[model samples]
Target: QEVKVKDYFGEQTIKLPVSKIIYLGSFAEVPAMFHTWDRVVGISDYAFKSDIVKATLKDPERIKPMSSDHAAALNVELLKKLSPDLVVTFVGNPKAVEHAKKFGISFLSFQEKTIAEVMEDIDTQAKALEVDASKKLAKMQETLDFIAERLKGVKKKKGVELFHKANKISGHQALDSDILEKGGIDNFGLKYVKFGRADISVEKIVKENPEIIFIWWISPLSPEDVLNNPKFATIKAIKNKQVYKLPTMDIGGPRAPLISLFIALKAHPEAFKGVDINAIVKDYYKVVFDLNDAEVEPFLWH
Candidate 1:
């Protein structure tokens, strides 16, 4: 039987059954939407370490990581080695998608800019799997609605600027400040510079004196290091204990339902007094990673 899957690019109907799947991007929605880790034969190395996906599928061997940068070069020999039924990649990389086609391999592209887009991708994947997606879609919608409700009456805090500092040598970047602004939080990072490699000094960060400092632990420095830095201690965010760490992939993608949830809960823990984030995470795993509770627990933050 032929499989029909809708994707960001368009409707994709494949005759061959996808026994083995390869994921080139680190977006969590792909794994989260499918709720089945068994079908994924390979994944980017970064996906294995992802908090959302890792909890559901702990065995990294199944979803082996392939360097997307290297994959872009399109070594046909490597494609033959993997022998994947289908190759899934992000739309941002045209070269990788072209290479997959050159090798006569089926490829699907998805956009990860927002939560709604991710849900659409999930539906598309479900169509490809020839499985019912209505339930999953409903669940995801509910989660988004819950997030909206949480932010309904949130009074915008003054002088409460959020600075998302990238930990890499490339310097700080403000990737998801739009989401923060939607949630009624001030974003300081947007005012600093555009995306890509940029530099920001400690003096600059101090000058901003943001109320909430969200740091991306990209590399080298850990979350603990950012929190423990003596120079950072003088910042208002550090003094007020408003510093936070967000998952890198979640912020990278457009479908930010889970990311929104994370931010909402963090911004207004008191508003979500009885909500069980752990349970929500588990549910997300079950639907997205296709894992049971026991298997999902290890990947969640305590």
Candidate 2:
């Protein structure tokens, strides 16, 4: 079968059942979502560090490195040698766009900032790979429906989702904010920022007085740093000790629902009392990745 999809350049056709895939900073869980790990021949060097890769992939060495994570640069020689069936990466990778053209390779790009966009990516990739995604998508929808149902009447709290940069925060238009909203929290960043990352002043944070704060993994500033700052001593999150650290979220993959649930559990523990979160995560791995005994620690707080 041939799959017709759009990428950075324009519409393109790719042969179905892509047996040799190269993931250039794409979410490793994408392959896991579809159980296509055996087809993956290479991954970006930085993506190899992903918890999904370590906990799921049985033979990590099989998917050798083909590109860098931060620079978005690829090893041209390796690309030509492997000659993958399809090269997948997030949009805005100028190097991959150029190299894909030069090598006449099928390049698929995705941009996921909202839950809908994330689902679209999953459906699009499933279509291209000629895999059935009905069940996979259904599970995601169920998780969302469950969260909305469980959080009914729960008071929404103001919060910020911070990542690598301490001051950089997500606004309403971004996935992080959307996740926060799904978890019954109002993203405080929406007050000043619109879309994407924007720097905020400590003074602004103190003024907002968010009830909770979420620091993503690898952040330059730790939860302890936020809690210990004398300037922030008066903030609601600091005073209440509601600051939490979470693993890096890959909204583009199947884990979006679970990540949203995690936020919900942390932001409103009373709403989810007696809800075995450990059991939920365990089931998530079993259904999404088919890992019955996978260690959930890597996917949990650092």
Candidate 3:
């Protein structure tokens, strides 16, 4: 059966079963999630840097570079040479679509603005790969349900999630903000940001008096750095030492629910008392990504 995906460009089909895949997207963990790494023929260079990819695929060189950067631009020659059965990417890149059409390659392009859409992307990919993801997806929802049930009557805490730096704030449309919102935290970035991220001033953060500050995993900036900064020393998050380091932002793949729960655990510690997040992490990774033990470390907090 062919996997038909409806995106902005109309209907796109992936001829199943996909044997050779070129997954060129920020969510490099897709192949790992379904345990289809062996079928992946190429991926973005940025994927090579992912801890998930590193832990899942033994030889990085086996999968060639689908894009030099993070799927921003595709290598026409490489795409032509590989001639993969499927190319999973974003709809934002017109050139990729053009090249795929020119080469008659099957592709599944996506545009995800929120965590809800991220789950939809997973469903689409599951169909394309012919992988049974029902149980895996249900597990993700279980985490979400667990958090929602716990925080039912609790007041939403004021919070701000940063991408890679202190100044950069997550946009309302970004999956980061959605994660915070789902975790029962009122994201401060939502008030100032819309579709795009912003370079916010420390003064604004100080003024807002956010109780929780979350730093995305990609950021070189640590939680301690924010806590120690004199400029933000007076901030409530800094004073309360409520800053946290998050995992990678897989905006087009699974794991948002787990990330959300991580944030919830920090925000409402009392609600999740005696709940072993480690075990939850282990089970989610094992079921969704077909990963276990050592490979789960990448998704875990230090």
Candidate 4:
């Protein structure tokens, strides 16, 4: 079965039941949402730092990790060595785009920022990977439906102003305001900035005075840093003790749905008062991480 899909260069084709995959992206973990990386013969060197990646890979050393860690500058020689049927990377990877023809490998780009775009990614990967995604997609829809059902009459609350940053340093959101919006939090700085988040600007942050600030758990500024910054003393979120450290969702992984639930539960607790959060967590871990309650317990925050 020849699976024809569209990519940046305009058109691409993949024979079905295709094997031998590779991933090389800053957001290296996204493609594994609907499926695991068992078929992934190679991956970016940086992927090993994440347990989600290591666990999904099945055998850590068996798969060939890249020789380079830089997203913009992948090792072309190493890539040639792996010679995977498919390689996943960023849309902006001019290097990959430039040399893909030289290496004779197909690739997909993780160039999504919104929820709908992410859903499209599932279809894209499923077609290329030649895997059945009905069950996983159904679970995704159910999660969306559950969140939608809870948010039925919910309108944006003004005091619910939110500020979020993604990286440990020199990093933030570009098109992440949409995800925040889906979770019903008004970005405190959205009106003032084109990009939802960016590098440090204590002045701007304090001026916005968001009621809630969700910083990345693995970020330059830790939750305590945001809370205790002398310049941030007057911000309502810090003063009111509402600074939250969230898992990194910007990586475009299976964590998006769960992170959305985490946001919704935090932003509108009363709306989800009837829903059992533990059940939600259980379902997510079982599907995404393949971890039952016993295995996923340590990762459970709620």
lDDT, residue 286, model 3: 85
Pick by lDDT: which candidate is best?
3
| Candidate 4, 179-246: lDDT as tens digits | 56666776655555554344546576666567776765445667787777777789787787777766
In candidate 4, what residue range of length 10 has the lowest lDDT sum?
A: 166-175
Model 2: how far residue 281 lies from native, Å: 2.7
Instruction: Please write out the lDDT profile of model 3 over residues 1-302, one tens digit for every residue.
Output: 76668764678866778898887765578888788888888877766666667777876767787654434465667777887887777655676566556667766777677777887788888888888878988988887888899999999999988765787897766777888888889988887888656788878888998999998776789988888988898888998899998765454567778778888988988988877778887888888878757767767655
- Lowest lDDT sum, 10 consecutive residues, model 1, at 163-172
Question: Which TM-score value belongs to model 2?
Answer: 0.88
TM-score, prediction 4: 0.82
- Show model 1 residue runs off by greater than 4 Å: 1-13, 28-35, 51-55, 58-63, 68-75, 156-184, 192-204, 217-219, 228-234, 247-256, 274-302
For candidate 1, the per-residue lDDT at 90 reads 68
Backbone clashes in model 3: 0
Q: What root-mean-square deviation over C-alphas does model 1 reach?
A: 4.5
The local distance difference test score of each candidate is 0.60, 0.76, 0.78, 0.62
Tell me model 3's lDDT, rounded to 2 decimals. Answer: 0.78
The stretch of ten residues in a row with the least summed lDDT in candidate 2 is 293-302
User: Candidate 2 has which clashing residue pairs, if any?
Assistant: none
lDDT of 1 by residue, 1-302 (tens): 78766665677767656677777764544655555577777776656555656454656664556764534633456666788777777665666566567767787776544456666666666666666778777776776787778768877532222223432212223335445554445555455556533456667677777666554434445556666788777777677777666555455432355666666666667777877777876776576456676877774646
In candidate 2, stretches whose alpha carbon ends up further than 4 angstroms from where it belongs are: 7-10, 66-71, 75-78, 93-102, 293-302
lDDT of 2 at 289: 70
